[PDB]
Design a protein around this ligand. Sequence first.
Ligand SMILES: Nc1ncnc2c1ncn2[C@@H]1O[C@H](COP(=O)(O)OP(=O)(O)O)[C@@H](O)[C@H]1O
Ligand SMILES: Nc1ncnc2c1ncn2[C@@H]1O[C@H](COP(=O)(O)OP(=O)(O)O)[C@@H](O)[C@H]1O
Lengths: 235, 235
Amino acid sequence: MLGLKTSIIGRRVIYFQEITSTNEFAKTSYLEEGTVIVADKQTMGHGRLNRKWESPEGGLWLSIVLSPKVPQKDLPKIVFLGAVGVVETLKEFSIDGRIKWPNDVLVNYKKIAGVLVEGKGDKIVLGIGLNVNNKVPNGATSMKLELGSEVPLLSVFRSLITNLDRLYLNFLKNPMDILNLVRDNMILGVRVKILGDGSFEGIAEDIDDFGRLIIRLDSGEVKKVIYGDVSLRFL
Amino acid sequence: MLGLKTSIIGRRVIYFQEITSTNEFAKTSYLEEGTVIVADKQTMGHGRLNRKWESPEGGLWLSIVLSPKVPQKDLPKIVFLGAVGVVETLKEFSIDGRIKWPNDVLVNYKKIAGVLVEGKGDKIVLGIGLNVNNKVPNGATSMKLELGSEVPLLSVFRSLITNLDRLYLNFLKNPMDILNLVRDNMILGVRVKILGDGSFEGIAEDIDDFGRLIIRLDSGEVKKVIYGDVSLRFL
Ligand SMILES: Nc1ncnc2c1ncn2[C@@H]1O[C@H](COP(=O)(O)OP(=O)(O)O)[C@@H](O)[C@H]1O
Ligand SMILES: Nc1ncnc2c1ncn2[C@@H]1O[C@H](COP(=O)(O)OP(=O)(O)O)[C@@H](O)[C@H]1O
């Protein structure tokens, strides 16, 4: 009855009035590629660094089952597909979403969306949490707060699914293309602090051909940050 | 993201761009009570009497998984819940639908919807096919043909699910109530013919406490027609 016209993402959609976590349901259940898990609210969601995520009613909480069979070298770039899809949808609604490496989307430096990618073997689950009309944690923001009015949740869903499907199909054939889109929509040229095994600061210059964040420390040293247990803070 | 507020029916919804049959999927898959299976199109759908059911894009093709904890005697009345729910939704859109015993809904004697109820294990699958914006077989009709304009498919879905949830919750407590709703919305007082073995004609007088169609033959004989592989024709 939704009349989706996508090729892979959205072939099937499982909607829940309530769920613990769309990513957990997607990871655990036997689902076909392209199946989307979406819920009005999540009671136990979390972000990329396993830190609690608030998912009250009004937001877009979904996960997508993917089985990308691309070279092991390009597989890690899957993490950016969700962030770019969100940016494109936000632009369609005239909201200036910008990517905070590696998976977050901010608007005026306030988080409006988070991306959580989890993979086990062939199966990759792409989770996205986008604040639309819901209340958000202090410091974060939403589409409603940015536009000054409520936005039809279903319209955002249709827009995002369409963008993601296009991005995904092109990624399977041309895995490098996504990096250019990330580069054009990422927050760069500013000082940042990289938090992992210790910490270091420098200018976030760009992302390389592997999606690594390139940081220039004041000494001139160049470090390349890989996707993982690392947090980025703007100074 | 659909924001359904129903209690049981619609707690979960599985949407398909394309499916063979919503009833078959609901029958062969483990699904919690209230799960709704819906598809843009069915490639192998059929009606109560096993005849192919045209399910092209534009219509509302769904199945609902139910496990009514009511006396065995009442279980057979589920089909009526579907027909009454459709009639209530049609009225909301200013369409006067009437029930053709036991599972069809007609508008000016043209079939606009069919109900197919099947049981597997201890669960019941309530299937409903409602013509909305899709092309229909000769002699049939749709909400679009009746209103002379495109009808928002999702609005019809929301309406129907809301009506069915209400009807079902009451059925669990007062299972006899549905019969009265059926009577008040069924085509009666007209001549009909029961086809097949032992075929006969008479006036469709009413339905009894078991939902059997009461027919008065010209001889004065009274026959009670049971739900099942029964074919009826208006004379
Ligand atoms: N709905 C929400 N919108 C924006 N930010 C949120 C929301 N819910 C939680 N957060 C923030 O996001 C964090 C979860 O994402 P995570 O990637 O693990 O955090 P981090 O920002 O430390 O990388 C929480 O610790 C919280 O500060
Ligand atoms: N989308 C549709 N809308 C209305 N009627 C339909 C549709 N698809 C099929 N039909 C009609 O319904 C019949 C099958 O329904 P079924 O309940 O099994 O038996 P019958 O209606 O003949 O008693 C088909 O033979 C056809 O005439």
